[PDB]
Design a protein around this motif. Structure first.
Motif, mmCIF file in Angstrom:
data_model
loop_
_atom_site.group_PDB
_atom_site.id
_atom_site.type_symbol
_atom_site.label_atom_id
_atom_site.label_comp_id
_atom_site.label_asym_id
_atom_site.label_seq_id
_atom_site.Cartn_x
_atom_site.Cartn_y
_atom_site.Cartn_z
ATOM 1 N N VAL A 60 0.901 -1.146 0.000
ATOM 2 C CA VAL A 60 0.000 0.000 0.000
ATOM 3 C C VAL A 60 0.939 1.193 0.000
ATOM 4 O O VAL A 60 1.523 1.558 1.029
ATOM 5 C CB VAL A 60 -0.977 0.024 1.196
ATOM 6 N N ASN A 61 1.090 1.790 -1.184
ATOM 7 C CA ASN A 61 2.225 2.649 -1.519
ATOM 8 C C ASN A 61 2.044 3.973 -0.789
ATOM 9 O O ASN A 61 1.640 4.992 -1.357
ATOM 10 C CB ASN A 61 2.331 2.841 -3.027
ATOM 11 N N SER A 62 2.353 3.939 0.505
ATOM 12 C CA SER A 62 2.323 5.135 1.328
ATOM 13 C C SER A 62 2.926 6.311 0.572
ATOM 14 O O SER A 62 4.049 6.239 0.074
ATOM 15 C CB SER A 62 3.092 4.886 2.634
ATOM 16 N N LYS A 63 2.172 7.397 0.488
ATOM 17 C CA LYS A 63 2.698 8.602 -0.130
ATOM 18 C C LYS A 63 3.638 9.233 0.888
ATOM 19 O O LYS A 63 4.209 8.532 1.732
ATOM 20 C CB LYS A 63 1.579 9.558 -0.580
ATOM 21 N N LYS A 64 3.927 10.508 0.728
ATOM 22 C CA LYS A 64 4.757 11.206 1.695
ATOM 23 C C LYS A 64 4.308 10.917 3.130
ATOM 24 O O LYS A 64 3.141 11.129 3.478
ATOM 25 C CB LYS A 64 4.673 12.712 1.393
ATOM 26 N N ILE A 65 5.225 10.390 3.949
ATOM 27 C CA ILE A 65 5.087 10.430 5.403
ATOM 28 C C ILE A 65 6.207 11.305 5.910
ATOM 29 O O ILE A 65 7.365 10.905 5.852
ATOM 30 C CB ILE A 65 5.183 9.062 6.090
ATOM 31 N N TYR A 66 5.886 12.483 6.421
ATOM 32 C CA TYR A 66 6.897 13.275 7.097
ATOM 33 C C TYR A 66 7.324 12.563 8.362
ATOM 34 O O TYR A 66 6.555 11.826 8.963
ATOM 35 C CB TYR A 66 6.353 14.646 7.469
ATOM 36 N N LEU A 67 8.577 12.734 8.727
ATOM 37 C CA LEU A 67 9.054 12.403 10.054
ATOM 38 C C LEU A 67 9.393 13.729 10.710
ATOM 39 O O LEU A 67 10.241 14.458 10.209
ATOM 40 C CB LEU A 67 10.258 11.461 9.991
ATOM 41 N N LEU A 68 8.712 14.057 11.795
ATOM 42 C CA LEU A 68 8.875 15.320 12.494
ATOM 43 C C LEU A 68 9.372 15.085 13.914
ATOM 44 O O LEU A 68 9.178 14.023 14.498
ATOM 45 C CB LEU A 68 7.560 16.110 12.559
ATOM 46 N N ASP B 105 9.769 11.515 4.280
ATOM 47 C CA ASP B 105 10.209 12.890 4.092
ATOM 48 C C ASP B 105 10.695 13.362 5.460
ATOM 49 O O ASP B 105 9.957 13.963 6.229
ATOM 50 C CB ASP B 105 9.064 13.763 3.537
ATOM 51 N N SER B 106 11.953 13.092 5.770
ATOM 52 C CA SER B 106 12.455 13.499 7.075
ATOM 53 C C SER B 106 12.581 15.012 7.150
ATOM 54 O O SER B 106 13.181 15.657 6.269
ATOM 55 C CB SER B 106 13.817 12.878 7.388
ATOM 56 N N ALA B 107 12.030 15.561 8.229
ATOM 57 C CA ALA B 107 12.335 16.903 8.671
ATOM 58 C C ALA B 107 12.814 16.859 10.107
ATOM 59 O O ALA B 107 12.460 17.688 10.936
ATOM 60 C CB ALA B 107 11.144 17.826 8.503
ATOM 61 N N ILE B 108 13.656 15.889 10.407
ATOM 62 C CA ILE B 108 14.261 15.809 11.725
ATOM 63 C C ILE B 108 15.388 16.835 11.828
ATOM 64 O O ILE B 108 16.293 16.880 10.989
ATOM 65 C CB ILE B 108 14.762 14.394 11.996
ATOM 66 N N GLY B 109 15.276 17.740 12.797
ATOM 67 C CA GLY B 109 16.171 18.873 12.864
ATOM 68 C C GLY B 109 17.208 18.892 13.960
ATOM 69 O O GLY B 109 17.898 19.906 14.117
ATOM 70 N N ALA B 110 17.388 17.808 14.694
ATOM 71 C CA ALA B 110 18.408 17.752 15.724
ATOM 72 C C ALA B 110 19.219 16.525 15.420
ATOM 73 O O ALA B 110 18.652 15.473 15.122
ATOM 74 C CB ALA B 110 17.847 17.672 17.136
ATOM 75 N N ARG C 290 16.619 19.869 8.841
ATOM 76 C CA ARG C 290 15.895 20.808 9.689
ATOM 77 C C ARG C 290 15.269 21.914 8.839
ATOM 78 O O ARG C 290 15.719 23.054 8.810
ATOM 79 C CB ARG C 290 16.821 21.356 10.762
ATOM 80 N N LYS C 291 14.168 21.561 8.185
ATOM 81 C CA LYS C 291 13.405 22.396 7.266
ATOM 82 C C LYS C 291 11.963 22.549 7.732
ATOM 83 O O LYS C 291 11.478 21.744 8.521
ATOM 84 C CB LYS C 291 13.372 21.768 5.879
ATOM 85 N N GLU C 292 11.279 23.588 7.223
ATOM 86 C CA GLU C 292 9.823 23.601 7.259
ATOM 87 C C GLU C 292 9.226 22.486 6.408
ATOM 88 O O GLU C 292 9.661 22.258 5.284
ATOM 89 C CB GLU C 292 9.194 24.878 6.690
ATOM 90 N N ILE C 293 8.166 21.850 6.907
ATOM 91 C CA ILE C 293 7.218 21.153 6.045
ATOM 92 C C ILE C 293 5.819 21.727 6.275
ATOM 93 O O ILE C 293 5.550 22.379 7.289
ATOM 94 C CB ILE C 293 7.185 19.659 6.318
ATOM 95 N N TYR C 294 4.908 21.418 5.335
ATOM 96 C CA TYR C 294 3.491 21.794 5.391
ATOM 97 C C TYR C 294 2.598 20.606 5.030
ATOM 98 O O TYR C 294 2.760 19.997 3.968
ATOM 99 C CB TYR C 294 3.221 22.967 4.430
ATOM 100 N N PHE C 295 1.593 20.337 5.861
ATOM 101 C CA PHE C 295 0.660 19.245 5.598
ATOM 102 C C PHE C 295 -0.329 19.691 4.539
ATOM 103 O O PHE C 295 -1.039 20.684 4.738
ATOM 104 C CB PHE C 295 -0.103 18.833 6.849
ATOM 105 N N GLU C 296 -0.299 19.029 3.387
ATOM 106 C CA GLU C 296 -1.440 19.051 2.491
ATOM 107 C C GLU C 296 -2.551 18.164 3.075
ATOM 108 O O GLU C 296 -2.295 17.321 3.944
ATOM 109 C CB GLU C 296 -1.075 18.528 1.106
#
Lengths: 534, 181, 534
Positions: free
Chosen positions: A413-421, A461-466, A485-491
């Motif tokens: 089940v081809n998970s689309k973007k999963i951010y890691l925050l 989509d890692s946005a882990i900043g430390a 360590r970037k901004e992401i935005y939830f669509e």
RNA sequence: AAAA
RNA sequence: AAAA
């Protein structure tokens, strides 16, 4: 302390003997019969003792009138002396037990006795009388024990071990345990078996043979009762898995503890333990740690629940099987559409109770839903379903769950973007002015599973900043995650895994990976799933 | 409960009916004629005047509004799931809500940086307690939130002097957060 | 035709005797032991016969080495000759049965024998050996019979009736029937009992003792199975009432037919019949003819269903009890709001699953609905309910159903206008331009009940326009109804009873009341309820 | 308007 | 944006 003794009468040479009850061998009585030594020993305990003899009228006359019967006159004289320090003895007449009707007359006599007694204990001294009578009565007790439960003991005065009168209550015990074993084995009823389990525990506790707290018989019986209650009453798969795992662990410890303990008959209690071995646990996907995935829908959890459906059917619990089958298919819809994180969310569950492979899945839902309503609505408004149709449908649905579960272990089940925050924030696009978010607490195992799959599906989509969080994830989970360590935005429809501190440190402080390990020890590190529904 | 909500609810009921009359062409026998509609509009406007009076005093009892400097969604250790709603506000909207929270005595500040205290006090002429504590959203609780629309280096805290420039180009964001579940 | 015989060994004076099996007394065998005459008689039927003897080693040596044991050497010599026309005989050693461990060794021996046998029948010739052993084994069979089911017969060679070897299979029968009786009595399981019922029928059919077709044992067993299936699987109260009424009638006929039939042991089969007497039928409102009110909600139908809820609880069927309880409360809402005619209408039922006394009724619905969902949704999304809470809630709800059912037999649900019409027309006011109508087929009993109540509530608006219909109603139902051949018009919410011809005669023809009676004989007269919902 |  |  009020006791009634029952025995047949015979026509052999009734000798004068030494009789001692095995459980207290210091006391002996010189009598020519088993009930008489029994009754004397019993009045020797400050008890009220009365006797009754079943005398085929042929014994009444052939034996107990012929004064030309040396030993017969012996026996009658000893009977008369039995008036003694007070013991009532009296006789009903019985047929030869020649045929069906006669054995039934014997039974009716046993019944009459049993009802008319106003005392505590009845001892079945099957020693004397044509044994042919005695064999029937032993079973007759079983029947009447389970159909007024006062107290039994069945004894046998063995001549040629002198002569001790021996408890043979075990003969009715094993047929008692036959009711227990069958009732559970075919129906999962624990009532009967809990008596024996608490039973054996109190004896070993009272005599230090086995080691309780390694038997954990108290735990085993309490867990048996709750597991039956979770089967009979449709219950969350989380509770079912919890009890099954507790019962595996309890069962292994008590199995170890048995050890032919140095009276607590051992073989039957072992026969039943294996039934759970075979009936319950051995058909269950236990290597996956279902207990550890309490919050999400998973294919292994579907597997565990499929076999629980199978067991429910084996125990004539078909209606719980239908209920569980429908909820299981909602679990599958959840998984196959990538909504597995909505598992315990009531709203989503009803929203999917309405809203090639997917076509197969949806047809199976339609039909399973129908049959569930037939059951859950009493068949009202002419929507009834009968047992044979229901079991037929249950088997077809289970076969197709297998078909789907194979064809689905292939479908990624081809998970689309999963951010890691690394914080439970709800950032939305500057385009956007409002948003609706769903946050779910995750287990360390669930988090690791989501993350692992995201990496292999290559959709993280890692946005882990430390850097230390990178440190900690890689060690604690043996997975490599970019430092970005970037901004992401939830669509709408995007999801994030989140790894967070469950504490508010001073400003600016970054904890080192050693410190994160320390927090994680006393549960100050939290895992979450965040989804934007709008 | 009180007489006022009953007043408001009845007036909707009736406005609804005759709006539906307009809004479905009167089909299925639901017509309204021009003069009745004009009368009803005027009657209804009188009562709106009445309602707006009754509400202009009503201590519309805002419950706890937390004040946050991040758009985080904490739930009680008690809870395992949550549904939250977030809305982007203007500096005016922010000031209005915040002022009212302070006047109604319902503000639960968890602002954990004095630089934000500085900022709020200057840009809004409102003084707000500094409190670096956890709060948790119970169902039905709300938060005002003020956050940087930028993710800087770690440990970086901006001087109020720099934050002025941040505020200049819409680099300071105001949000409303409501927990619906 | 392949048979294994098991017997203990003894130390008495083993005489040479005449042995005949009771069921064929023309054949006799001169042997000094019971198994030997048994085995000779069996090879006398072209069967394969083998023997095994359980010999306490004390018997092995004390008896079967002393050639100074006159009869012992007798017995050993006869053993050697038993090689005869081919009969295998061999021995395992057994302890004295002194204590728990020894009886268990005896059991393990019995087990070893049973498994290792590759034949059809095993005969337990408990005749010889210390009887103390024999009493245990009889029960041991029961246990092992229900825990490979091949074939049993247990026999006893009575010396002092010569000497016939007697079937004593009945001793294990009655413990078998004890499992049957308990399993039903506590759990309503019919599996066990259907064996005996079909069992006894085939014997009386094969021997013309009782009169089948007055026993109707075939009907009784088939109905037992279906009634259990209607209990386990939530089923329309109409089917439950149907089977219960069929089973009353069947039960009375078979009870009459038993008559101490001239082998088909009678007392147990009677004990069970009374259990249904007591457990099932005797707590049921049968004087109301629930079978006759199949189409509407009634207070007596609520009463029948309340007791069926009670029985469901007595048999550990709690989840079916919750389901039935919710549907029952919808039945009560229906009745109390005068929508009883919507009973089997799915739409109305869900429309009332959403849409002082009424307040009590609605609170009880809210709460019962909650608990039903806990069960019918697997407790998902953290909505589980446990057994103890469920039974607690079940009892409180039943108590309040009684409270309501009393306070409701007083509340005259004050039926407004009910027209009585003589055709199934849908007239509306000239005011009106459209209307929505609901028509329901009524039983002659339902029609009469509605009409009777309408007259006593004084809310009947007769528009019956043929004198012969007045004629027919008054006779067939003993109720007086005005002749008023007028127009009526259904307002929203008005209802009509209707009495109609289910046939289209020539034009203008009016049938005389005699003719209406004739039509009603072959079901050409139809009753209906008509309601205007809009 | 016991199918104007 | 491990609570700007």
């Amino acid at each position: 302390k009020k006791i009634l003794i029952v025995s047949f009468l015979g026509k052999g040479r009734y000798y004068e003997t030494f009789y001692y009850s095995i459980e207290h061998s210091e006391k002996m009585v010189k009598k020519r019969l088993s009930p008489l030594a029994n009754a004397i020993l019993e009045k020797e305990n400050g008890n009220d003792v009365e006797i009754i003899f079943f005398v085929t009228n042929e014994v009444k006359n052939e034996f107990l009138y012929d004064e030309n019967n040396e030993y017969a006159k012996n026996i009658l004289n000893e009977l008369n002396e039995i008036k003694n320090y007070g013991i009532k003895v009296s006789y009903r007449d019985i047929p030869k037990g020649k045929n069906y009707e006669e054995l039934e007359i014997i039974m009716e006599e046993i019944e009459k006795l049993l009802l008319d007694f106003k005392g505590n204990k009845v001892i079945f001294d099957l020693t004397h009388g044509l044994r042919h009578m005695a064999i029937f009565t032993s079973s007759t007790v079983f029947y009447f024990k389970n159909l007024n439960k006062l107290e039994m003991k069945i004894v046998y005065g063995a001549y040629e071990i002198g002569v001790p009168i021996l408890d043979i209550t075990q003969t009715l015990e094993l047929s008692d345990l036959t009711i227990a074993l069958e009732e559970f084995e075919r129906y999962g009823i624990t009532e009967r078996m809990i008596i024996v389990l608490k039973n054996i525990q109190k004896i070993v506790a009272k005599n230090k043979l086995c080691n309780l707290n390694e038997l954990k018989f108290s735990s085993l019986s309490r867990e048996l009762k709750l597991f039956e209650e979770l089967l009979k009453i449709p219950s969350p798969p989380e509770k079912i898995a919890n009890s099954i795992y507790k019962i595996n662990d309890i069962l292994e410890s008590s199995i170890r503890e048995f050890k032919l303990c140095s009276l607590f008959f051992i073989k039957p209690i072992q026969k039943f333990l294996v039934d759970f071995q075979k009936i319950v646990l051995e058909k269950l996907p236990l290597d996956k740690k279902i207990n550890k995935y309490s919050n999400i829908a998973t294919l292994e959890k579907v597997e565990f629940m499929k076999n629980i459906i199978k067991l429910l059917i084996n125990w004539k619990m078909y209606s719980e099987a239908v209920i569980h089958l429908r909820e299981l298919l909602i679990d599958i819809k959840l998984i196959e559409n990538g909504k597995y994180f909505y598992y315990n969310n009531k709203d989503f569950r009803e929203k999917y109770w309405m809203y090639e492979l997917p076509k197969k899945i949806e047809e199976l839902l339609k039909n399973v839903k129908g049959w569930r309503n037939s059951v859950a609505h009493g068949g009202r408004a002419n929507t009834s379903i009968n047992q044979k149709t229901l079991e037929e449908n249950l088997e077809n649905a289970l076969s197709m769950i297998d078909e789907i579960l194979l064809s689905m272990k292939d479908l990624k089940v081809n998970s689309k973007k999963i951010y890691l925050l690394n914080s439970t924030i709800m950032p939305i696009p500057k385009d956007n002015q409002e948003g609706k978010f769903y946050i779910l607490k995750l287990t360390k195992n669930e988090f690791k599973v989501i993350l692992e799959n995201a990496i292999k599906d290559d959709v993280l989509d890692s946005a882990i900043g430390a850097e230390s969080v990178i440190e900690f994830i890689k060690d604690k989970f043996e997975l490599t995650v970019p430092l970005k360590r970037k901004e992401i935005y939830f669509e709408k429809g995007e999801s994030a895994l989140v790894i967070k501190l469950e504490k508010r440190p001073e400003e600016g402080k970054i904890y080192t990976k050693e410190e994160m390990d320390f927090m994680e020890e006393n549960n100050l590190i939290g895992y979450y799933y965040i989804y934007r529904e709008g | 409960d009180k007489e006022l909500p009953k007043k408001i609810e009845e007036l909707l009921k009736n406005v609804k009916g005759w709006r539906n009359s307009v809004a479905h062409g009167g089909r299925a026998n639901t017509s309204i004629n021009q003069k009745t509609l004009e009368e009803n509009l005027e009657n209804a406007l009188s009562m709106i005047d009445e309602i707006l009076l009754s509400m202009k005093d009503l201590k519309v009892n805002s419950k706890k509004i937390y004040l946050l400097n991040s758009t985080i969604m904490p739930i009680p250790k008690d809870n395992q799931e949550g549904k939250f709603y977030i809305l982007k506000l203007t500096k005016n909207e922010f000031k209005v809500i915040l002022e009212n929270a302070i006047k109604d005595d319902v503000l639960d500040s968890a602002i954990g940086a004095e630089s934000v205290i500085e900022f709020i006090k200057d840009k809004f002429e409102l003084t707000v307690p500094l409190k670096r504590k956890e709060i948790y959203f119970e169902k039905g609780e709300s938060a005002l939130v003020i956050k940087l629309e930028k993710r800087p280096e770690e440990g970086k805290i901006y001087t109020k002097e720099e934050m002025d420039f941040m505020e200049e180009n819409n680099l300071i964001g105001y949000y409303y957060i409501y927990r619906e579940g």
